[PDB]
Design a protein around this ligand. Structure first.
Ligand code: BCL
Ligand code: BCL
Ligand code: BCL
Ligand code: BCL
Ligand SMILES: CC[C@H]1c2cc3[nH]c4c(c3C)C(=O)[C@H](C(=O)OC)c4c3nc(cc4[nH]c(cc(n2)[C@@H]1C)c(C(C)=O)c4C)[C@@H](C)[C@@H]3CCC(=O)OC/C=C(\C)CCC[C@@H](C)CCC[C@@H](C)CCCC(C)C
Ligand SMILES: CC[C@H]1c2cc3[nH]c4c(c3C)C(=O)[C@H](C(=O)OC)c4c3nc(cc4[nH]c(cc(n2)[C@@H]1C)c(C(C)=O)c4C)[C@@H](C)[C@@H]3CCC(=O)OC/C=C(\C)CCC[C@@H](C)CCC[C@@H](C)CCCC(C)C
Ligand SMILES: COC1=C(OC)C(=O)C(C/C=C(\C)CC/C=C(\C)CC/C=C(\C)CC/C=C(\C)CC/C=C(\C)CC/C=C(\C)CC/C=C(\C)CC/C=C(\C)CC/C=C(\C)CCC=C(C)C)=C(C)C1=O
Ligand SMILES: COC1=C(OC)C(=O)C(C/C=C(\C)CC/C=C(\C)CC/C=C(\C)CC/C=C(\C)CC/C=C(\C)CC/C=C(\C)CC/C=C(\C)CC/C=C(\C)CC/C=C(\C)CCC=C(C)C)=C(C)C1=O
Ligand SMILES: COC(C)(C)C(=O)C/C=C(\C)CC/C=C(\C)CC/C=C(\C)CCCC/C(C)=C/CC[C@H](C)CC/C=C(\C)CCC=C(C)C
Ligand SMILES: CCCCCCCCCCCC[N+](C)(C)[O-]
Ligand SMILES: CCCCCCCCCCCC[N+](C)(C)[O-]
Ligand SMILES: CCCCCCCCCCCC[N+](C)(C)[O-]
Ligand SMILES: CCCCCCCCCCCC[N+](C)(C)[O-]
Ligand SMILES: [Fe+3]
Lengths: 301, 235, 281
């Protein structure tokens, strides 16, 4: 066997790395966690440190609250019985208020109230996590790419749980918290709108989702193929093109007639991915607010 | 109808984006050239983008791309045919001349630096706190080439400090000098390190580095180039 | 016709078949024996499709469509106009893809790189062959296979899913989707990380990989690192396709009832099957 570089043959360890400092408030970093030899066959062995300032704590706590709020309900649904809770874990579901209660906060706790509570906690968890995305980049003086990108995922999520429910006039439109039930909701959403395969946004969204797998397969494989010339050192290949970046470009140029740069491929990447949820959120938002039936709309348009 | 506006607008956006992305990917290698180095007539339908400048850290300078392009090296190849699009035959030894799958680029003759400003890659002997943490330690193993002859012995691992990974094995030859082999081009086995790209007699021709505790980008390119070239040029 | 750095790489050698016979380029494209194989298979196949277009009676790509033999030819041939056209086109597509891969190998050898790309491609080819070859055969007919047209192949996906109820419940299909979504998460993160380092706040210096590690350790308390992330993207995305093929090869063969009902093995386990309460008692 020629060697492939999917798993490291030899791991190597030195002093825990505590990171760059730049404008980060160091008072808010933990200390290093342990080292995972397991991870280190494939990636870095070092866990932590993590940074937990105020926004960090806020986010993490509501996040758990959202999670426990669903879990208390799940236990309730299980009549507090350990064996039943496990047996039925994928079946339990925390459902939103019925259509009757509109967008109001009136519904009883056991029939929507809890759902609104968990959702509220989910809202603060995510938006605060978003800000943490921006702030951790700022402290290091980095571009805001990650937060811009995360915004695209947040878009689909907002549309499903918040914007589209509001525009439709009730919370009953939103996705329930449960493994099997959120799947049922997805299938049902499509049937009731005359089949999402007729939503042109839906099919763009798939093109990108398939495309992200295609692209990352291409890229990942390309980098590993030129890792015998230091290919994965991408920032330095951007600053000072090496033979890695040249062989990479030329593989593709010879294969398919055009190619990328070591910087540009990352622009193709971020956009392939981000467009999955962009077009996606658009498709969902338009459903039932403007277009009641994709098949039908397809026949006119 | 809104959904119609949105979809139509979207195709227009996407065409804008593909354009932007394609021109972004033209910041290197362009303008296209004829086999002789002059500008090709046909550049295709995308224009070069407006230059951008990267500010390199540690007073290493800037980079402006696209910019005037240049191999900054002689290329020992000649045409094998009378028209565009055929192979160019090595005029000498392609391993020594660095062409074909033995190519290297004229990268900066300084070493890559970490974010602290220290050399990125060091031999482990000189790297404070660094030791093999898992897997068979190759240090001390005989090194065998694709001729099944022993070409030397592993005398250290050169490691990447910030990313904590092995990047080269340092190998000592019959004559007592050493060479770097890329970590990705060896197989560590229980009783030897095997190198399928080179036969024993080609080890001496691995490009040497000038300091024994650092490697420059230019020296990395020559080493990796030379070793990868053995896949074609050794048998 | 050459990138500014290209000429030094354009040397003889690498080819798997033909020695120097097709060792050359056309514009940017490398040719090789397998470039020739690809053109031939693809040309024939497009021809057969344009032919198959007239026998059906359009020149509209939104309508052009080509079906397997009907269910009753089993695994035998069929009049061109009733599914032989499809059988041959499929043979063409296979020959085109496998050819494209083998040409990718030839380019690898010339460039002194590793074989990861065509290896990765070979997963996609295997997914395809699962839909049109392996599944049909295990199932006894060409007619179970996906057909070729832009909107009609969606019809098939839908009819195929709904044959087993909500296909969501196929558990290999669940693992597959999980890889798809995860791969896109990782692609967004990767692209954004590298870009954020190479294009920092206005006026600042390019950041470094250590900045990239630091950003992630700060954010979630772990960073897989730059070798790791390319390993990851490759693994996520090949794993998605692996499970995709898996989820379909087991469907209509070892399982053919409503997928939702598969999950009963879990709930029907002795130690809890009969306890009352919850959803299933
Ligand atoms: C997109 C259309 C539907 C939808 C359609 C589907 C379909 C179809 C499938 C899933 C599947 C999943 N979906 Mg869903 N999903 C939707 C929106 C969501 C949202 C959300 C907040 O909007 C969440 C949290 C999830 C969560 C999930 C997971 C249970 C699962 C794997 C997701 C993943 O890999 O993500 C990114 C991956 C990561 C590793 C990052 C996140 C890590 C973990 C795993 C997230 C799980 C959170 C959850 C609280 C854990 C369960 C707790 C119990 C103790 C098990 N879906 C929308 C409404 N989803 C698949 C599945 O297996 O379902 C059973 C599946 O087949
Ligand atoms: C994979 C699981 C299902 C499937 C389910 C779906 C679903 C569901 C959807 C599609 C959609 C698409 N699928 Mg399909 N599709 C299947 C198998 C295939 C095969 C195949 C040869 O196996 C092909 C070529 C296609 C091609 C297509 C495209 C028409 C479209 C966008 C795909 C994409 O962007 O991918 C990622 C790849 C890239 C971005 C690279 C570019 C790929 C280009 C666009 C392919 C064009 C092919 C051309 C139209 C037809 C042949 C060309 C000539 C005859 C040579 N599908 C199987 C049967 N496919 C979406 C659509 O919009 O349908 C109308 C959609 O919603
Ligand atoms: C029978 C079911 C219907 C159908 C109904 C739907 C519905 C309904 C929807 C989709 C959507 C999509 N469908 Mg469809 N889908 C069908 C058939 C298909 C087929 C196919 C081969 O047939 C494919 C390939 C797809 C593919 C897809 C995706 C391209 C797209 C969602 C993208 C995504 O990344 O969401 C996953 C990403 C998210 C959900 C973003 C989540 C972001 C938040 C912020 C994360 C919060 C995490 C939370 C805090 C938990 C943290 C826990 C951690 C451990 C810390 N569908 C059929 C026709 N599909 C979605 C879409 O966009 O449609 C246009 C959608 O809403
Ligand atoms: C109503 C529909 C059912 C359903 C029924 C099915 C069925 C049926 C199938 C899937 C399959 C899939 N479904 Mg499902 N699916 C549903 C809901 C979903 C949802 C969702 C959010 O609801 C999601 C995200 C998914 C996602 C998925 C994936 C796991 C998988 C598709 C990818 C794939 O196989 O690629 C693999 C990639 C390929 C097959 C493409 C290969 C490309 C070839 C090698 C080369 C192309 C060259 C080409 C001709 C272009 C050349 C021209 C150039 C452009 C110049 N399904 C609902 C419940 N799903 C499919 C699957 O698993 O397939 C194995 C499948 O058959
Ligand atoms: C644009 C396309 C893709 C995308 C992009 C994307 N997602 C992102 C980002 C970006 C760019 C981020 O920057 C952000 C991030 O930080 O990534 C690491 C993120 C993120 N995407 C996430 C998930 C996610 N993304 C998804 C999808 C996608 N994200 C799209 C495919 C999905 C899908 C497909 O369904 C999921 C589930 C998170 C990992 C993170 C946002 C995190 C967040 O908001 O968290 C709030 C904090 C908490 C919830 C803490 C609570 C923890 C509990 C839920 C318990 C844990 C459960 C258990 C497994 C552990 C044990 C617990 C015990 C104590 C009981
Ligand atoms: C395995 C993980 C992912 C993957 C990887 C992957 N794909 C790849 C590669 C890799 C690593 C390449 O190296 C190769 C490439 O060159 O990419 C640019 C490729 C490729 N993947 C492509 C497409 C593709 N990949 C897809 C998916 C995936 N590819 C997976 C998600 C999809 C999906 C999801 O649907 C598509 C559509 C091409 C861009 C390219 C292969 C090009 C090729 O083989 O060229 C030779 C053939 C032709 C030029 C034309 C042949 C046509 C005739 C035989 C007739 C048409 C046949 C018929 C099937 C048409 C069907 C119509 C549909 C509407 C159903
Ligand atoms: C760091 O490295 C990296 C690069 O480099 C620096 C790269 O460029 C790439 C490559 C990636 C890109 C350029 C990003 C954009 C690519 C995608 C979004 C994926 C989709 C690709 C396509 C849709 C293009 C498909 C084109 C194909 C398959 C060929 C088109 C076919 C023709 C028109 C002619 C084909 C020629 C034949 C038939 C072969 C034989 C020749 C003749 C006889 C003529 C990657 C991954 C990378 O990681
Ligand atoms: C420039 O360089 C770079 C680095 O370094 C400098 C890096 O650090 C990083 C930073 C990136 C990371 C550190 C990686 C972050 C990690 C992820 C993105 C996610 C990784 C996830 C996995 C390890 C595997 C995920 C598992 C999946 C998808 C499959 C299993 C899922 C299931 C659901 C299994 C169970 C299924 C059934 C039957 C029922 C389902 C039930 C539930 C899941 C509940 C990047 C991005 C980078 O760019
Ligand atoms: C072991 O037991 C304990 C008790 C420890 C546990 O805690 C176990 C815990 C569990 C078993 C929890 C299991 C959790 C799940 C299964 C969660 C599954 C969730 C999903 C699959 C989510 C799918 C999609 C969710 C979406 C789309 C959410 C969108 C949310 C909205 C965007 C937020 C909207 C906010 C609202 C409606 C309120 C706003 C009000 C204002 C005033 C602003
Ligand atoms: C002083 C001890 C502090 C230890 C802190 C270590 C944080 C570990 C968190 C790792 C999990 C991140 N994740 C899930 C994305 O991989
Ligand atoms: C940034 C990457 C660009 C690649 C985009 C490829 C688009 C594929 C076209 C799918 C057709 C969609 N639709 C809705 C008309 O059916
Ligand atoms: C969506 C499929 C699009 C196929 C893209 C293939 C384009 C390759 C063009 C390379 C040649 C350019 N040219 C004519 C200047 O040489
Ligand atoms: C998914 C979209 C695929 C991108 C197609 C864009 C084609 C780019 C062709 C231009 C390159 C030709 N060149 C090298 C002369 O510039
Ligand atoms: Fe990369």
């Amino acid at each position: 066997a020629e060697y492939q570089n999917i798993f490291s043959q030899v791991q190597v360890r030195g002093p825990a790395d505590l990171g760059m400092t730049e404008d980060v408030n160091l008072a808010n970093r933990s200390g290093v966690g342990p080292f995972s030899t397991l991870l280190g066959w494939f990636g870095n062995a070092q866990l932590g440190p993590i940074y937990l300032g105020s926004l960090g704590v806020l986010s993490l706590f509501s996040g758990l609250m959202w999670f426990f709020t669903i879990g208390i309900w799940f236990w309730y649904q299980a009549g507090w019985n350990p064996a039943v809770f496990l047996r039925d874990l994928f079946f339990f579901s925390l459902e939103p208020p019925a259509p009757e209660y509109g967008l109001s906060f009136a519904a009883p706790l056991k029939e929507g109230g809890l759902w609104l509570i968990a959702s509220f906690f989910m809202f603060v968890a995510v938006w605060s996590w978003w800000g943490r995305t921006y702030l951790r980049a700022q402290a290091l003086g980095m571009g805001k790419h990650t937060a811009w990108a995360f915004l695209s995922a947040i878009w689909l999520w907002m549309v499903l749980g918040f914007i589209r429910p509001i525009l439709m006039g009730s919370w009953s439109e939103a996705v329930p918290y449960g493994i099997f039930s959120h799947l049922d909701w997805t299938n049902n959403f499509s049937l009731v709108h005359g089949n999402l395969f007729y939503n042109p946004f839906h099919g763009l969204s798939i093109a990108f989702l398939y495309g992200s797998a295609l692209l990352f397969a291409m890229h990942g494989a390309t980098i590993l193929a030129v890792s015998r010339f230091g290919g994965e050192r991408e920032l330095e290949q951007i600053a000072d093109r090496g033979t890695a970046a040249e062989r990479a470009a030329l593989f593709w140029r010879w294969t398919m007639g055009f190619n990328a740069t070591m910087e540009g491929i990352h622009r193709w990447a971020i956009w392939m991915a981000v467009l999955v949820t962009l077009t996606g959120g658009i498709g969902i938002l338009l459903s039932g607010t403007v277009v009641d039936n994709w098949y039908v709309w397809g026949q006119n348009h | 109808d809104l959904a119609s506006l949105a979809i139509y607008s979207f195709w227009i956006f996407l065409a804008g984006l593909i354009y932007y992305l394609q021109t972004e990917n033209m910041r290197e290698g362009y303008p296209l050239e004829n086999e002789d180095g002059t500008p090709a007539a046909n550049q295709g339908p995308f224009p070069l983008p407006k230059p951008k400048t990267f500010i390199l850290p540690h007073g290493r300078g800037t980079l402006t791309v696209p910019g005037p392009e240049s191999e900054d090296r002689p290329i020992a190849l000649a045409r094998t045919a009378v028209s565009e699009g055929f192979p160019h035959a090595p005029t000498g030894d392609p391993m020594k001349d660095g062409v074909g799958p033995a190519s290297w680029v004229a990268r900066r003759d300084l070493p890559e630096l970490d974010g602290h400003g220290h050399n990125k890659i060091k031999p482990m002997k000189a790297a404070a706190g660094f030791h093999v943490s898992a897997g068979k330690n190759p240090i001390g193993l005989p090194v065998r080439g694709c001729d099944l002859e022993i070409a030397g012995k592993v005398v250290d691992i050169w490691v990447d400090i910030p990313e904590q990974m092995a990047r080269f094995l340092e190998v000592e030859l019959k004559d007592g000098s050493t060479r770097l082999l890329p970590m990705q081009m060896v197989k560590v086995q229980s009783n030897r390190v095997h190198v399928n790209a080179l036969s024993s007699d080609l080890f001496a021709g691995i490009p040497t580095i000038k300091s024994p505790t650092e490697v420059t980008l230019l020296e990395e390119d020559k080493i990796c180039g030379y070793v990868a070239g053995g896949l074609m040029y050794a048998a | 016709a050459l990138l500014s750095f290209e000429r030094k790489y354009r040397v003889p050698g690498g080819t798997l078949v033909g020695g120097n016979l097709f060792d050359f380029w056309v514009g940017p494209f490398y040719v090789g024996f397998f470039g020739v194989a690809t053109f031939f298979f693809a040309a024939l196949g497009i021809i057969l499709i344009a032919w198959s277009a007239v026998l059906q009676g359009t020149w509209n790509p939104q309508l052009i469509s080509v079906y397997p033999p009907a269910l009753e030819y089993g695994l035998g041939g069929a009049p061109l106009a009733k599914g032989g056209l499809w059988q041959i086109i499929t043979i063409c597509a296979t020959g085109a893809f496998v050819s494209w891969a083998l040409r990718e190998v030839e380019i690898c050898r010339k460039l002194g790189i590793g074989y990861h790309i065509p290896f990765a491609f070979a997963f996609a080819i295997l997914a395809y062959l699962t839909l049109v070859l392996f599944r049909p055969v295990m199932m006894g007919a060409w007619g179970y296979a996906a057909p070729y047209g832009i909107w009609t192949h969606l019809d098939w996906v839908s009819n195929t899913g709904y044959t087993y109820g909500n296909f969501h419940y196929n558990p290999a299909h669940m693992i597959a989707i999980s890889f798809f979504f995860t791969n896109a998460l990782a692609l967004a993160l990767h692209g954004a990380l590298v870009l954020s380092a190479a294009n920092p706040e206005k006026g600042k210096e390019m950041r470094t990989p250590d900045h990239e590690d630091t950003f992630f350790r700060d954010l979630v308390g772990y960073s897989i690192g730059t070798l790791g992330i390319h390993r990851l993207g490759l693994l996520l995305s090949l794993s998605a396709v692996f499970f995709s093929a898996l989820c379909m090869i087991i469907t209509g063969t070892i399982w053919f009832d409503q997928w939702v009902d598969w999950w009963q093995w879990w709930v029907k386990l002795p130690w809890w099957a009969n306890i009352p309460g919850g959803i299933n008692g």
